[model samples]
Target chain A: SMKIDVVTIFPEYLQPVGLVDVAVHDLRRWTHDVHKSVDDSPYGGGPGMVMKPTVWGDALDEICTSETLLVVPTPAGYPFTQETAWQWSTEDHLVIACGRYEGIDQRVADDAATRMRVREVSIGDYVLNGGEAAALVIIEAVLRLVPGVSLLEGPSYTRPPSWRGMDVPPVLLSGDHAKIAAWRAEQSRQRTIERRPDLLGFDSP
Target chain B: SMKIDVVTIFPEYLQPVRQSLPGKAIDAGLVDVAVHDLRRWTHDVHKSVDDSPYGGGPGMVMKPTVWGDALDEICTSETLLVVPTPAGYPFTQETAWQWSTEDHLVIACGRYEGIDQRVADDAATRMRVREVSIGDYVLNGGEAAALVIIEAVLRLVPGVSLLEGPSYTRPPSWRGMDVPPVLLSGDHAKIAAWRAEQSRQRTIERRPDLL
Candidate 1:
């Protein structure tokens, strides 16, 4: 059970989201805290404003620990994956900096990265006003990886099958662990190859 | 302006979303609203599921004209038909809000080839099958992307802006640095300077393609 700290301008919006799913509902039981009200402006003169550093600095100082992993959801960041979720589940604590408007300041992410392992993740190629939804997706993905959470029969199921009509390989259903693993690797490779070839070089077995 | 009515197996999945940004805005009269279910229009016996491409293809494409009449009857005006396809324009937050402002928008959430290209073309000459790549990847359906677009655009409704504090400011936080001091100093002139530099830097670093 890893503790996650979320900082958002609308704390109310974040609370209801945690209740919609069983995984989120279970994960919230272990959340350390959530801080709202961060104000900052876009670095350049533009239409949108950015969250401030002081709020982030204060939030991080209060929430972060040596065992925590921090995540920033952005369009220009690394793509979230099943492996990333599996790895994150091992942490004792996690912090998510949800950005609105254009995005968070680069310094906020850099500073957080030095103190803790910070990653910028994208749910997909589309753009969103904030990272809240994407953060929720990450939370659900990682939380499901934790043991003892499910009473269902065999193997842990991570990714969704047949999104839009794209199907997960049949090997996953064959009930062979080694084959399943290999199949997942191949599917991950194929999916990335067709959709996001840029993520090809990342750490994968 | 066109009236777009979406018929899908997952109608409830889109309801709460309709209450959100652009959907909510449209509901509140800032924009128009016409949403429906695809199952209501189906004439088949088994409520048959779409199948994979005959020879070989990327994924299953939804049947053509399965519910074509639903769209034709609901779309009263000369609408700009948009099918949310992986091949469509990457849906952006800006585009969502901008679309909401349009005189009319008829969005269809096709489960498979989205809808047939011929049907899509027949609906409107100004057909745009948006391949909105949120990233360089694909999702199971266009519904998620459609929801995102609806939310982003709905927030732009005239009265909706008063609800949230303000759009998220930029140059707020980056690779460990804080928002420049000028913003915190309460100096409007210097704050603007820092904001511009930071926004550009952030956009450049994150979305260099945009620059």
Candidate 2:
């Protein structure tokens, strides 16, 4: 089972949603753990304020191990994708650092990078006052990839066909394994092309 | 002042944020209040959820008449109607403060591709149809951005500073962090100097373009 730790200031703000909601239910069913840690502002100067490194270090020390993946959510980070979520589902442990106010110190991120697979992911280009909502979105998206969790029951859940108000391609309903694979491939390509055309190979359509 | 009304299927999701933030000044009698339900303006269509765009856009667009009637009733020369969209100018602390001081503000949160361009244009003639973006990413709805704008603006309202303390007066506490030492010294002149330096550093780091 994989364990995920979230470092945040407003533990109350994050606890209810993280534990009682869909992510917690699905993760616990699969025998995974989600932990939360809080910290105060950094000592000297920065935009807004940042969560203290000592608090983060303490939390990370307790939860992180050889099998953990340290993740940070930032607007400047690489774009997150379904593929990334699928990859993360296979990890044994995950640690997430949520930043509020302006952002966290760059050193905290650098320190984590050395011990585990450090990934900085961005859901979009805009700035958010806090990363909690973004983290929730990422967690929900990634949790879907876990084995045995049915995608049909989640709130705000939309399947491929129903997504974008389009019908599910006929191949998925055909029950032919080979046809299903081909249909999914085409759907993924079409969806990516229509919405995020920038992601399409620069040289090819 | 312009009056904008938001008709949402999930009104509760939006009400709390408004009452707590952007609308705070209005609640305190500093600004006028104009909140209307979209359903109230629905013309004999049995209160349909949404309307389809004429040219078949990606997502559902609200009916022009519904928005037109609402804007017509509330908008004036002094009003600016803002439709929060991902395609709009990014929301900023400065923008929030500016909007809060306006005579009137009408905010519309569109569920889909938003209202048709024609409806937007019509509303524009009567009120400013400014597009504002909260960040670079996509949100499920405009409600979240509305909340962000409200929170940012509410903090700007005179006398509203009582909600959060002066703790933000100092630079971040991290050792070797960028904050100046004068803020810790408790001297008024030194504190002001430190604040200026801190704001400069923040502008340079998070928003270099502002510098």
Candidate 3:
């Protein structure tokens, strides 16, 4: 069993995770101000605000242990992949630092890297309004694998067998096990060829 | 202005978003938003929404019948259907920019194995359908990707940002980490110069393609 701590200002963003065993701590808990402010305008001037390093650093100091792995979700971080999820799942403890606005002070990641194993991961090439969504996505990916092919499965169908003149492939309904298996393989092969020839070790011809 | 609809099993997964950008966009009347449960259309006693794939497989495939019913009720002729899947094309900022301009959008989130392929095939005849993958990784379901895509798309609908560099807030010094002197120098020209260099270095080290 892995112990996970999520530090975020928007704790509500992670409520759906109640089904799992994890701690969702609010970063504002570390602030000393009357307003509990966690962000301020960037020093070099930018349209969006930057997460204050002091707030993040204070929260992290209390949450991390030498054995803990610190994960910071950022668009600029290394891309998150199935393999990364698998690697993190094996850790005994993880603390995910979720950031909003532009991003956390770069130093938060740099400083934490010295005391504990740190990874700055990105779910994709795109950006999000905050790291809450990315954090939830990462958590779910790691938890659920508690299950992949590099290839995308071909089309799937179900009961009604026929709907709006569309019919499930006859082979699937034929009750011929061997024929059904072969059909699925062919479909998977063709789909890989059509949608992702790159996966097949060549470009589409 | 745009209209967005998200269909998923874990509506609570999106409950927090109500106070985020999507919620703000709704209040400003810049975007009309709705979240529907996939189980709403199920007629079975258990409200079952998935079935074994036609050809046997490891996981259950989302039933085409239920999904078909949900989309028929939620989608319009003008809607662009966005399906998030590992098999789909890569989703980029450019894709979000393109989708932001649409008058209407509908995102269908599939769980278990995936939605019946027939659903997308059928919907393509009447409206534009885009099956997009957020990145190279696979998620547990489409809800996370929907959240990602919604944030990505809606941010552009109202207005937008540069591929910004790291940010430093107040408290000029903290735990021995000091804000670079150039940032606190208070000279706009030098500040701009420092920012450009930081952005360049950050990009070169993190994402060089942007260069």
Candidate 4:
């Protein structure tokens, strides 16, 4: 079992997310201001505001245990793949800090690293409105593997067999099990090559 | 203006997302977000939406008729059908920008193995179809990814950038850590130059390919 905690200003954005041991904390819970402020203008002149380090530090300081892994979702971080999910699933505890706008202060991650492990991971090649959405994605990926389990390499079909004049390739309907498997495999291969050839092996024909 | 209609089994997963850009866009009449429950199209007493794959698979696959019925009713000539599948091409900032120009977007949120193979193939014969994957990792469903994509695209619409900032605020000094002295200086030119250089340095260190 693993304990996962997420700290973000927009806790409402994560209302639907849950796990047996998961907790979603509003960053304002650690703030002292009347406005419950958690972000400010960037140190350098920039259009987007940067998250305040002090409030973030307080939130992390309180939530992070000695064994906690601080996961920060950012576009500038390392790509988060299945391998990373496998690695994170083994962690005892995780405190994910979801940043908005220009992102949390660099010092927050820097300081947290001294006390516990800090990993910054990006969900994909795109930028998001905030890390809350990214947090949902990351948490879903990592937690699915927390039980030592588990990609989109193929297409699938269900009942009805035929729809809108489209027939489920006759091979799939064939009772010969091995023949059906080979046909499915070839279809999977051809679809991958036609759509996401980038994921193909270097020697793929 | 853009119209986005998302069909998913878990419409509640998207309830809180209207807190910002999505809400603002709707309020301004620039965009309309309609969330539909896929089960609404099911005719069975159990409202079932999934079935075992044809060739056999570890898990069930989303039924073609359910998705087909949903798309047939929701899609229009100008609609751009976006199917979130790990098998599809990467969804990037560039793609988000391209989608922002479209007048309508109908996102198909598939669960289990995924929507039937013919869903996208058939949709392409009519309206535009884009099968996109948010990242390399897997998720329980497309509901979460839809939130990310919606936000990324909505923020790009004109007038949405109005809410976009400086790095620090009052009480600049905290726990012996202070906002950079350069930021406190009233020299806008110096700050602009510093920010530009800092961004350059950050991109070079973190994502050199972006440079």
Candidate 2 stretches greater than 4 Å from native: A1-8, A11-50, A58-96, A101-107, A119-129, A132-205, B1-7, B15-37, B44-46, B73-76, B90-94, B158-211
Please provide, for model 4 over B90-168, each residue's C-alpha lDDT reduced to its tens digit, 9 standing for 90 to 100. Answer: 7988899899898999998888778888888898998999989898888889998899899888878886501111246
Model 3 has a DockQ score of: 0.59
TM-score, candidate number 3: 0.89
DockQ for candidate 4, please give it: 0.51
Predicted structure 1: lDDT: 0.54
DockQ of each: 0.12, 0.06, 0.59, 0.51
How far in Å is the alpha carbon of B123 misplaced in model 3?
Answer: 0.9
**lDDT (Cα, tens digit) per residue for candidate 3, span A2-98:** 7789999989888877324699998999999899988888886878888888888889999998898999888877668889888877778889999
Name the lDDT of candidate 2.
Answer: 0.54
lDDT of 2 by residue, A1-205 (tens): 4566666554433442322122121111221235432334533333456444545555566666766788877765655656677787777667777776666655566667677778877654445566655666566556656665401100011122242233434454566777655554665566455433444543212
lDDT per residue, candidate 4, A4-53, as tens digits? 89988888888878334888998888989798887777664556777888
Error of 1 at B167 (Å): 12
What's the true lDDT of residue A2 in model 3?
A: 76
TM-score winner between 1 and 2, please give it.
Answer: 1
Sequence-dependent TM-score of model 2 = 0.53
Candidate 1, B45-105: lDDT as tens digits: 8664354432233556555445456666656554545565544444555566556656655
For each candidate in turn, the TM-score is 0.58, 0.53, 0.89, 0.89
lDDT of 2 at A78: 59
